[PDB]
Write an enzyme that holds these catalytic residues in place. Structure first.
Site, PDB file in Angstrom:
ATOM      1  CG  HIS A 351     127.756 -29.103  40.263  1.00  0.00           C
ATOM      2  ND1 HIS A 351     128.273 -29.778  41.347  1.00  0.00           N
ATOM      3  CD2 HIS A 351     127.963 -29.899  39.186  1.00  0.00           C
ATOM      4  CE1 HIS A 351     128.784 -30.927  40.942  1.00  0.00           C
ATOM      5  NE2 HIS A 351     128.616 -31.021  39.634  1.00  0.00           N
ATOM      6  CE  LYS A 542     131.907 -20.859  52.136  1.00  0.00           C
ATOM      7  NZ  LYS A 542     132.047 -22.112  52.910  1.00  0.00           N
ATOM      8  NE  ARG A 543     137.650 -18.797  43.635  1.00  0.00           N
ATOM      9  CZ  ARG A 543     137.982 -18.943  42.354  1.00  0.00           C
ATOM     10  NH1 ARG A 543     138.499 -20.085  41.918  1.00  0.00           N
ATOM     11  NH2 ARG A 543     137.800 -17.937  41.506  1.00  0.00           N
ATOM     12  CE  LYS A 548     131.515 -20.288  47.826  1.00  0.00           C
ATOM     13  NZ  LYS A 548     131.467 -21.386  48.872  1.00  0.00           N
ATOM     14  CB  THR A 650     132.519 -30.242  49.735  1.00  0.00           C
ATOM     15  OG1 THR A 650     133.301 -29.260  49.053  1.00  0.00           O
ATOM     16  CG2 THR A 650     131.511 -30.851  48.769  1.00  0.00           C
ATOM     17  CE  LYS A 654     136.824 -30.090  51.221  1.00  0.00           C
ATOM     18  NZ  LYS A 654     137.509 -29.068  50.367  1.00  0.00           N
TER      19      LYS A 654
END
Ligand SMILES: OC[C@H]1CN(CCCc2ccccc2)C[C@@H](O)[C@@H]1O
Ligand SMILES: OC[C@H]1CN(CCCc2ccccc2)C[C@@H](O)[C@@H]1O
Lengths: 810, 810
Positions: A351, A542-543, A548, A650, A654
């Site tokens: 992952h 998102k986390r 990120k 992901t 969306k």
């Protein structure tokens, strides 16, 4: 009301109403005079649940009769969210229940808001497992999700003075109508003890026993009458546990703590004993269940023909040595045969390439907790390295690089290496990620066994992530092309012939505006915050992690604010910038970034000169239920991780399905998304993976950018001097220090191109017709990113089973 | 099959069958092909449960409409046993369900055996509360049982090598169909903190909060459509509890431990903090619930007109200062008015005169845990002693004797003194006990307030303890006098006119023989032990304590064995001697007595010379479900406590109702039992209370009896020398030492008269007709000992409410 929500027939509505009243009386022990909205939710949940069980029983009977190959998906996380609406959608009950409840004088949407999220995951990995379960049922696969029934899921996030506070997610408080306890299928799990060698093989003795009690939750396929099972284990102490008397009973908690709480770190690796216990607990109980079901169909030659085990990350990696232990120690198969069966049964999904997520367990923990498993791991390693040595004679450094055992201060076991060794297939989660795996961290393994390595690009279920959360868009699409696309998302390509259709263009933009208005109202009703619904909804949810690059977004926001302050009477496209996500509780920097976002809001949202031209809102407690609300309302999707870090993403998919345009780096699935839509229809910016590598070889110097970009210099000066923290001038010194001296993710390096690309976004938004036409081109090419596609590929290329859209009899 | 079990109509049987199948499918998610007997039990339980809820809802609606005075029965124990059969009996559903299940191809009695006992009590005190709930519902009182929902009830007793072993009673493992969680009525409970004084009164601040979550269980009256509520509290941590993150979540156990486990000591006083927490927890949550319900009917003058609080022992004694705290600190009533309300509301039942059961809490515990309550207790004491001082001027020793505060090494609070001070009524549980209270331990209080002191002789419910457990006897009685006696047990007096009826005599003896055969079969099927069903069933079942003198029984058993060994070929009436009961886990002597009983069995049961003339069996895991089996099979009931120690007993009454003759001392309710039946119809022996007092004043010398009774000397010599423990000759040295030198209960003093009286028993048993005629005279006079009588007396003489046999509409 709308077509996609099914029929509301006279017989069905009348029957739902009476069953609703029956549950309210007999099940909830209430009458209308004392019932609260919560009681009404439960009455409806029980009514809908009844429709599942008939199908649930005959599906499992069907699998018993036909004895197909079974798929076991092992995950420590299933981020399910709410179940009520999903169930109605998949059973074609939504309009009927809407009507039935309306006639009872109730608003169904109000009742739907009462349900707690099942929050048994952190983010992307957990939600993927949940999308996968939906797709496996929709594609008629004999699949079982296996995990842990955590008493507490992901914490609820409260923001206090701009700081994240955590509180326990007591999700079971009011009960869970969806699960069925199965105490009759309780299984023992062994811990500690020691290994004895006898005339006839090894024996694991003097163990402490913990019981694993299963809870089954139904997983309905989309309108095919298939209902699969998610089985989650709960830890239970045996009745003779520690058997002063009172203390012995109270100490049962020690055993039962195993299933108490989900580690909330988004699977950042923390080598804690309790986590290892959780990992073995799910593995040991699951494998006993698998073997039991297999024997009730001696000859384990056919085991791989009837069983596939998918390891979701390395978390259930202990399945490999546990399967060996069972076959060798208990079934008395010889090593070579047992190993053949194990490899053919297991497959491993990686992952991420980021080292902080890699599980490397200290040998001393495994020595004490799982002494037999350590011996098996050592033997696997020895035999694996002998193969390496024979393939690459004399290559001594390859041997140490490929070893499952890492030497050093403390010896560790590399769980990723174990998984590759013991699996017939290893896959990444997007094309770029799978390529990076073969080129970098698993290069040695790819050279030894190239056939093992595959790609399976992630996806999302179009049921939850379009039909459920955006009925308005699902409906306008159904009008033109019918309803077939819901289980065949490739059909959205047909929407390309409507890109010049003035009616369709108007409808798409109308659905978006309605979503935005609805979300703007939600923000006021539940959080008392005022936003302009005519502004561009710029969202990053998102986390919270440094990779990120929420900080890159923050730098842009401040740039916009500084530009307004410089030329106040100049026109700028109004924006509402929304950022949300949870930080791991022990992750100091992530918590500081949250504080920074709120601090920027405090300055920007209250400046009279800015007006309603720029708003910065931190979305509290981001979770699946909130995702279903904010994603349909978004105009711009922020997917801005440093190239090479986000394995897939992901959330990106969306947003694409729901009519938002994407600003993003060429990272993870962003690459395949842009490829599908055409690069002209995406806002791509920044370094590619190759440019990142070039910068690393040269050495990243953040000072260079600071020196050469005056707008960037101003922001850093503002942060350092206390512009965004007047009472605590030095509050953000750690952030500035990290940016300037130890930024692993090269925030400054992408700043210029990001700001420039954002200007291009604002320019397009000024032209509503051309914005919407580009939106249509995104929605129309989002088909590849259905988890039905992903799962069909797993089925055919890894599990060796054929998906089926064929109905089971109702 | 039998009359007393109700009608089995065509419509009802058909309806039960379909609802059974509905629950099996929809509720249990099973079909006939996979269902186990346990599944069938649950389907039936759910079917019967449905019949309760309609009545449950309208009963509680009825109480809301009519607003009667409410009775709150506070107990830390409710020993409920199984619920299924009791529910069927009270709803007149037993034959219908019997028929319905028979037609489905199922044996109902087999299904009934699957249900776990609700074992939320130790023995007599807990079972009394359970009988009381049944009677209150049968008599149409608006009554609520309030307690703690222990996760673990009384331990399951295993016997290993003659030694008691304990194991956790995981009674909730498979779920409890009878309870309804009510998380919506969750209430906060406060602990620790400190007291602040302000301008306007005291404030209890800085407290730790534990949540009390209620679970409601229905309590059906006998065939009157009344269904009352037993509400049990479960401890829950608040969601911000201790909020590293993981540890904070795991530490929630600290708060939730409050409702984890029932103290298994039969309420021998152990001054443990956790026990005090349990006591406050039930009290604080209950009183909030009471006040809430009262306010939903300012003026607390009417509080005692609408509320009665019955304190079952001193365990909920904190209700007195908690009620004061609420009225004074929160409602702002003045002290004098608050006190008036408190006294008129509360009543206290004393359960024993034995000092080891008296609750005397260390002041330092209350200081830390409940600082405001300690201040209130001090104030109550001060004002109480001022009253004492005014009534008996100059009597300084009375002042120290009556104080709620006991001075000494550690200061303690006498909870019994608190209860008398703060209650308008204080009652003992049998006439002799209530007299002893006034004459000895509460003499000072009786002199001050004679009007407070009452008697309420205990009773048992004739539903559970005749109809349910002995249908055969209930039926032969119903044939002659009808069914009215079941809720009017005084009608059994009509059986006196059948004492010379040859048909009735034959039937009584027939029912007993059938019970004995059934129990003899049970012993083989579930414990593989062989007994002669033609022998006299001599049984002593009750908790193991020195005051109950199981050791006196042991001495008789050995006497019989020695007499057989002396004259083997002489005829003796064959006996099966059964002794059962649990010992408190930390009670060494009680555990030694169990071992002694089994050791005697080991010698006696395997001696060829004895044959089947004498058998000694220890009944394992004595509990309500076992009581319902063994009591109907008994011929002789052993009630042999030292005179003045057993406050009442209730087991004695159960045996009397079920056709056993009683050998017993003039103790507790034995006195009133003999008075009712006539002393000629009881086997009374031994010292009376007065003789015990005379012996204490003279000084009890056990050596005297040893010296003067050769048969007794032989037994002691046998015990000491290792006759009953060959491999461990000294095993019973502690028992012998206690008997010889420090026996508080004067075992030797009653030995001669006991053995002599036992000879008289055996003589009567040789004459079956005359045995049975005496049995008939016992059964016929057992009416007084119905808990309907007891509760009617509480209602009229303490609570100020009128019982009613009138039906509520179905
Ligand atoms: O495959 C599901 C998701 C799995 N995540 C795993 C994130 C793991 C991680 C967690 C903390 C720090 C670094 C990495 C990456 C996303 O790109 C994927 O979409
Ligand atoms: O009132 C219910 C019963 C209550 N029990 C209380 C026994 C209390 C006790 C517990 C341990 C040691 C000494 C005394 C006495 C019986 O006679 C009664 O029938």
């Amino acid at each position: 009301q709308i077509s996609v929500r099914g029929l509301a027939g006279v017989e069905n509505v009348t029957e739902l109403k009476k069953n609703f009243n029956r549950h309210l009386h007999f099940t909830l022990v209430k009458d209308r005079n004392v019932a609260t909205p919560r009681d009404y939710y439960f009455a409806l949940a029980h009514t809908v649940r009844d429709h599942l069980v008939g199908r649930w029983i005959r599906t499992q009977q069907h699998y018993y009769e036909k004895d197909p190959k079974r798929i076991y998906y092992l995950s420590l996380e299933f981020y399910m969210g709410r179940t009520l609406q999903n169930t109605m959608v998949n059973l074609a009950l939504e309009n009927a229940c809407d009507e039935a409840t309306y006639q009872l004088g109730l608003d169904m949407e109000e009742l739907e808001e009462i349900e707690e999220d099942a929050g048994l995951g952190n983010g992307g990995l957990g939600r993927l497992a949940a999308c996968f379960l939906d797709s496996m049922a929709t594609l008629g696969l004999a699949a079982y999700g296996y995990g842990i029934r955590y008493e507490f899921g992901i914490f609820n996030q409260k923001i206090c003075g701009g700081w994240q506070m955590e509180e326990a997610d007591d999700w079971l408080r009011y009960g869970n109508p969806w699960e069925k306890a199965r105490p009759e299928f309780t299984l023992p799990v062994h811990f500690y003890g020691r290994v004895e060698h006898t005339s006839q093989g090894a024996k694991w003795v003097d163990t402490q026993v913990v019981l694993a009690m299963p809870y089954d939750t139904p997983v309905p396929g989309y309108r095919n009458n298939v209902v699969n099972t998610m089985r989650l284990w709960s830890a239970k102490a045996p009745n003779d546990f520690n058997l002063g008397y009172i203390q012995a009973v109270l100490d049962r908690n020690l055993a039962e703590n195993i299933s108490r709480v989900l580690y909330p770190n988004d699977n950042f690796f923390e080598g804690k004993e309790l986590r290892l216990k959780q990992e073995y607990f799910v593995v040991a109980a699951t494998l006993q269940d698998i073997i039991r079901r297999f024997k009730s169909s001696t000859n384990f030659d056919a085991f791989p023909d009837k069983v596939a085990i998918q390891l979701n990350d390395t978390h259930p990696s202990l399945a490999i040595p546990e399967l060996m232990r069972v076959l060798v120690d208990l079934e008395r198969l010889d090593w070579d045969k047992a190993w053949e069966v194990t490899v053919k049964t297991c497959a491993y999904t990686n992952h991420t390439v980021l080292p902080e997520a890699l599980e490397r367990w200290p040998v001393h923990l495994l020595e004490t907790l799982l002494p037999r498993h350590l011996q098996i791991i050592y033997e696997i390693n020895q035999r694996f390295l002998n193969r390496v040595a024979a393939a690459f004679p004399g290559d001594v450094d390859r041997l140490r690089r490929m070893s499952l055992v890492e030497e050093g201060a403390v010896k560790r076991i590399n769980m990723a290496h174990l998984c590759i060794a013991g699996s017939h297939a290893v896959n990444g989660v997007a094309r770029i990620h799978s390529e990076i795996l073969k080129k970098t961290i698993f290069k040695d393994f790819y050279e030894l066994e190239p056939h093992k390595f595959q790609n399976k690009t992630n996806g999302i279920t179009p049921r939850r992530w379009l039909v459920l959360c955006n009925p308005g868009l699902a409906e306008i699409i159904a009008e033109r092309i019918g309803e077939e696309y819901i289980s065949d998302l490739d059909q959205l390509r047909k929407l390309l012939s409507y890109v010049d259709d003035e009616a369709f263009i108007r409808d798409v933009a109308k659905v978006k505006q309605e979503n935005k208005l609805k979300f703007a109202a939600y923000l006021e009703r539940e959080y008392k915050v005022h936003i302009n619904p005519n502004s561009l909804f710029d969202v990053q949810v998102k986390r919270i992690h440094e990779y990120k690059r929420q900080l890159l977004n923050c730098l842009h926001v401040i740039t916009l604010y500084n530009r307004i302050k410089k030329e106040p009477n100049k026109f700028v496209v109004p924006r509402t910038v929304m950022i949300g996500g949870k930080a791991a509780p022990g992750y100091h920097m992530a918590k500081m970034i949250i504080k920074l976002i709120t601090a920027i809001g405090d300055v920007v949202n209250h400046d009279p000169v800015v007006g309603d031209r720029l708003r910065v809102i931190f979305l509290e407690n981001y979770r699946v239920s909130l995702a279903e609300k904010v994603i349909p309302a978004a105009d711009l999707s922020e997917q801005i991780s440093t190239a090479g870090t986000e394995a897939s993403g992901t959330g990106n998919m969306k947003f694409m399905l729901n009519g938002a345009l994407t600003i993003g780096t060429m990272d993870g699935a962003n690459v395949e998304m842009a490829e599908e839509a055409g690069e002209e229809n995406f806002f791509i910016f920044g370094m590619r993976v190759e440019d990142v590598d070039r910068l690393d070889q040269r050495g990243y110097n953040a000072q260079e950018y600071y020196d050469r970009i005056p707008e960037l210099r101003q922001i850093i000066e503002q942060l350092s001097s206390g512009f965004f923290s007047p009472k605590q001038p030095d509050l953000f010194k750690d952030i500035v220090n990290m940016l300037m001296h130890h930024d692993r993710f090269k925030v400054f390096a992408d700043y210029e191109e990001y700001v420039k690309c954002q200007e291009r976004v604002s320019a397009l938004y000024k032209n509503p017709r051309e914005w919407t036409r580009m939106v249509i081109r995104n929605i129309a090419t989002s088909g590849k990113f259905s988890s039905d596609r992903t799962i069909a590929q797993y089925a055919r290329e890894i599990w060796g089973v054929e998906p089926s859209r064929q109905r089971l009899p109702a």
